Design a protein around this nucleic acid. Structure first.
Ligand SMILES: [Cl-]
Ligand SMILES: [Mg+2]
Ligand SMILES: [Mg+2]
Ligand SMILES: [Mg+2]
Ligand SMILES: [Mg+2]
Ligand SMILES: [Mg+2]
Ligand SMILES: [Mg+2]
Ligand SMILES: [Mg+2]
Ligand SMILES: [Mg+2]
Ligand SMILES: [Mg+2]
Ligand SMILES: [Zn+2]
Ligand SMILES: [Zn+2]
Lengths: 135, 244, 88, 91, 103, 29, 77
RNA sequence: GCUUGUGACGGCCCGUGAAAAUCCACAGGAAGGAAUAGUUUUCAUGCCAGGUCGUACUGAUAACCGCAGCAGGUCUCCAAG
RNA sequence: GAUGGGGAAGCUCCGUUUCAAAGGCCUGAUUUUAUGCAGGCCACCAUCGAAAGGGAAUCCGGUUAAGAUUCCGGAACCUGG
């Protein structure tokens, strides 16, 4: 009956990431010491990869497949859950409550997320997650 | 005498229409490939007032079939049409209020408005507020449709002529009296210079055929033949009968 | 008679009124049935269906507007969606 | 208290224009100045702008209607006729 | 008791000829010509005023920085947050419905 | 292979914008 | 037209390669409730704007004059 | 309190009460770009230039029009006890 | 109110995007020289019409027999490059 789990894919509705697809890593159903509301820890895409055709060269294909990730704590009311899923075990440990409140630790976590997303995009799977929403 | 009042209106100097505040000519879409084969969907963005016209106007935006852009149309709104409503125009449109269909694609008894006299003239019949056209019969051979007009006349129209389902909004306007000369003044201020009107019998013979005399009277029959010339056609033109 | 059945569950069961509280119940999986008024916007109606599909919750459509649904529950105000937590 | 016996809103015209003409204006002025239920939001917040234009204060949805009423008797008959004809030609 | 005059050759009280009386360091009252007040930019969907956008005359927007004329979000200086929220929800739900209609 | 996808366009009535076709028959000479 | 409060940013203006003159203004002003004091204002004439540094401490005002560059032209009162 | 500016509202219409130049934002992603190096002149500072014609005064019981230094006529802003 | 066109013996009349093959800025191509030559873009198609409508940007002090938001002193702002 509960669908907000550690593999659910959601759509951000507010906060400079509106219209970006995101995946839930760690949910907190009953608030916390900070953020006194239902919220989840998510990792998403800030810059979707561009479309690739057969005419593009090797140097151009690699440039158009770059993905810029982000990490954010989002209220439940600002998320639109979907029916799609994406396993987060490759970067579940690095993204946690401790990775915040530290400028340097946030950068290291996002580098791990970028590696996982780029490998996920290669050998195409989770195609709906890597396709930008049009609105 | 001199040139009478009804002769001076054809020169069009001070008798032209006042068209500063008009929203634009109210026409249907140009009949194209989508209209005659399938249908195209439009969206009502707003319903606005038009100066000099009793009925309100609807702004409908369609997508350009052959180019990436939006095209805006000005329609005469029917009763029940609201902002945000989807409008379907074409041969394969459904029978709903606000949809544009050719007269050959509706059953007998359908109520339509903004009816084309000929296919492609973009609406000529039943445009004033509260008026409509009734479909009374079809002739599948030679592609003709029989319709009933607001004046009661029966007309035969091609079945490819388009029409809008429903009745023109704004009905019942003429049931409230103007109640004073000021309201009539502002009504014709947005239309043209035809008000107030001086009676011909109150003029001099040089001015009007009804003018002159020691009493205010016409002097001859007011029924005027169809063959009379300009300057004579004052009164009741080619009247088949008079009286109550 | 849906009016009679809905009247009884108010007295003996747990219910929820309003859009914001209904979504919260569906998000937490504590809703057994949601009742949606006839005059609600389609965009809002389609969003409640998507939440109910994810949580596997039955959806019933009320034959009346928000004014009528408020009377059926027993309130003097309009109600858009009713969430039934537990039946009586 | 009850300020006037029968003129109602037409008391702004005083003794002019004739009682019969003032009586007909009263019936239609009440209709055009009234509030109506919105079929979209359910609230009684519909008022006339220009003739034939009715807008909801809450929804901000504007509906084309009659000159002095949201829906005329003739327009209601049209909707019934179209609904009956649509069903026959679709099934 | 001190009276003022227009400082331009326009002698008529038009919209572009509005004045305000001020006192100068010289101790006298002198008229000051003020420009017409600006209007806030409006939303492209609902027509409400946009939050976080400077209110200037049209030609003054070419002198201020970009941060004054936008909000860090999609459709920043064009649509308000609520209209952007409705666009995203409507876009997602309709596309999901299209998939189930295909099958 | 896994980066390129097939995205056919629907050129029906009311669908995507029509492509450029040969209009020599309709040219206003 | 522009008031500068940081002492460090004032010294770099005097050697910005576009400054030619500066002036020192001494004002006798009273404090909130007691005896008056000497207020010194340092104004640097830039190419596009005038920068003014205001300090109410007489002791610190003397040190700034000594550290003022000799190339810069200074007008007293 | 007076004059005036402005804000949120309310009444009224079979009257619902200009246009264009011009300026900005967004959607879109064509191109262009880093490692011993480049882009930003929408952040700051610094450099140069900005032509042509009008500009005095009266604006009225004497500077305008009425044969005139004519009790006539002629648009408008500021407004003390 | 021109043009394209159509009227009129003609001085000229109609008409203003009209039954017209109606035009030019983003560059690429070229280091013979200046722009010929390749894609694509856009078809809007003269001009005149407000010293009270729309509109990029300046204020204070001082100065003359007679000028100043224009000169002087000080302090700003806009456009183009
Ligand atoms: Cl006459
Ligand atoms: Mg007489
Ligand atoms: Mg005669
Ligand atoms: Mg006669
Ligand atoms: Mg002006
Ligand atoms: Mg002068
Ligand atoms: Mg004279
Ligand atoms: Mg001509
Ligand atoms: Mg001009
Ligand atoms: Mg002078
Ligand atoms: Zn409503
Ligand atoms: Zn909005």
């Amino acid at each position: 009956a509960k669908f907000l789990k550690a593999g659910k894919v959601a759509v951000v509705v507010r906060g400079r990431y509106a219209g970006k697809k995101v995946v839930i890593v760690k949910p907190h159903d009953e608030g916390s010491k900070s953020h006194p509301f239902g919220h989840a820890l998510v990792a998403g895409i800030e810059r979707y990869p561009l479309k690739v055709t057969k005419k593009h060269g090797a140097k151009k294909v690699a440039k158009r497949t770059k993905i810029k990730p982000f990490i954010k704590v989002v209220n439940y009311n600002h998320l639109l859950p979907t029916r799609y899923t994406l396993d987060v075990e490759a970067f579940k440990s690095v993204v946690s409550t401790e990775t915040f409140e530290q400028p340097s630790q946030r950068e290291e976590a996002k580098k791990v997320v970028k590696k996982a997303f780029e490998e996920r995009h290669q050998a195409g799977k989770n195609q709906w997650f890597f396709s930008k929403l049009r609105f | 005498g001199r040139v009478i009042r009804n002769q001076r209106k054809g020169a069009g100097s001070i008798f032209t229409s006042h068209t500063r505040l008009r929203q634009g000519a109210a026409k249907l879409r140009t009949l194209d490939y989508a209209e005659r084969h399938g249908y195209i969907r439009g969206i009502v963005k707003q319903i606005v007032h038009d100066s000099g016209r009793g009925a309100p106007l609807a702004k409908v935006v369609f997508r350009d079939p052959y180019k990436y852009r939006l095209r805006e149309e000005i329609f005469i709104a029917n009763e029940g049409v609201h902002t945000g409503q989807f409008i379907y125009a074409g041969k394969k449109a459904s029978l709903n209020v606000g949809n544009v269909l050719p007269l050959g694609s509706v059953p007998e008894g359908t109520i339509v408005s903004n009816v084309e006299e000929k296919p492609g003239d973009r609406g000529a019949l039943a445009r004033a507020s509260g008026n409509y056209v009734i479909i009374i019969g079809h002739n599948p051979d030679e592609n003709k449709t029989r319709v009933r007009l607001p004046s009661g006349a029966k007309k035969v129209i091609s079945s490819d002529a388009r029409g809008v389902i429903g009745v023109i909004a704004g009905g019942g306007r003429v049931d409230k009296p103007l109640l004073k000369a000021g309201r009539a003044f502002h009504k014709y201020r947005l239309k043209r210079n035809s008000w107030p009107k001086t009676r011909g019998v109150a003029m001099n013979p040089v001015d009007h055929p009804h003018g002159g005399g020691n009493h205010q009277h016409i002097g001859k029959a007011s029924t005027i033949s169809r063959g009379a010339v300009s300057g004579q056609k004052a009164g009741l033109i080619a009247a088949r009968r008079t009286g109550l | 008679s849906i009016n009679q059945k809905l009247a009884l569950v108010i007295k003996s069961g747990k219910y929820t009124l309003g859009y914001k509280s209904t979504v919260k119940s569906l998000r937490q999986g504590k809703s057994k049935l949601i009742i949606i008024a006839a005059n609600t916007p389609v965009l809002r109606k389609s969003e409640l269906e998507y939440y109910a599909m994810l949580s596997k919750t039955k959806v019933y459509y009320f034959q009346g507007g928000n004014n009528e649904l408020g009377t059926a529950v027993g309130k003097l105000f309009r109600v858009g969606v009713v969430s039934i937590l537990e039946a009586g | 208290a009850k300020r006037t016996k029968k003129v109602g809103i037409t008391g702004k015209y005083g003794v002019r224009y004739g009682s019969s003409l003032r009586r007909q204006v009263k019936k239609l002025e009440i209709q055009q100045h009234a509030r109506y239920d919105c079929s979209f939001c359910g609230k009684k917040t519909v008022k006339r702008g220009a003739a034939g234009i009715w807008t909801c204060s809450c929804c901000k949805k504007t509906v084309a209607g009659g000159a002095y009423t949201v829906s005329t008797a003739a327009a209601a008959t049209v909707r019934s006729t179209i609904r009956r004809l649509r069903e026959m030609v679709e099934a | 008791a001190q009276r003022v005059t227009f400082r331009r050759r326009n002698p008529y009280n038009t919209r572009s000829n509005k004045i305000k009386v001020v006192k100068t360091p010289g101790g006298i009252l002198r008229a000051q010509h003020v420009k017409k007040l600006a209007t806030r930019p409006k939303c492209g969907d609902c027509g409400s005023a946009l939050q976080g956008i400077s209110t200037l005359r049209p030609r003054q927007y070419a002198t201020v920085s970009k941060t004054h004329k936008t909000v860090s979000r999609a459709y920043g200086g064009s649509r308000c947050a609520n209209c952007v929220k409705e666009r995203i929800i409507r876009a997602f739900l309709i596309e999901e419905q299209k998939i189930v209609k295909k099958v | 292979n896994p980066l390129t996808h097939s995205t056919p366009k629907n050129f029906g009535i009311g669908q995507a914008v029509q492509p450029k076709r040969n209009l020599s028959r309709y040219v206003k000479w | 037209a522009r008031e500068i409060t940081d002492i460090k940013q004032f010294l770099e203006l005097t050697r910005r390669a576009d400054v030619k003159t500066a002036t020192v203004k001494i004002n006798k002003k009273l404090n909130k409730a007691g005896k008056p004091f000497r207020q010194t204002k340092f104004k640097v004439r830039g190419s596009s704007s005038l920068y003014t540094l205001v300090i109410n401490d007489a002791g610190k005002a003397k040190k700034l004059i000594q550290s003022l560059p000799p190339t810069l032209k200074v007008n007293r009162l």
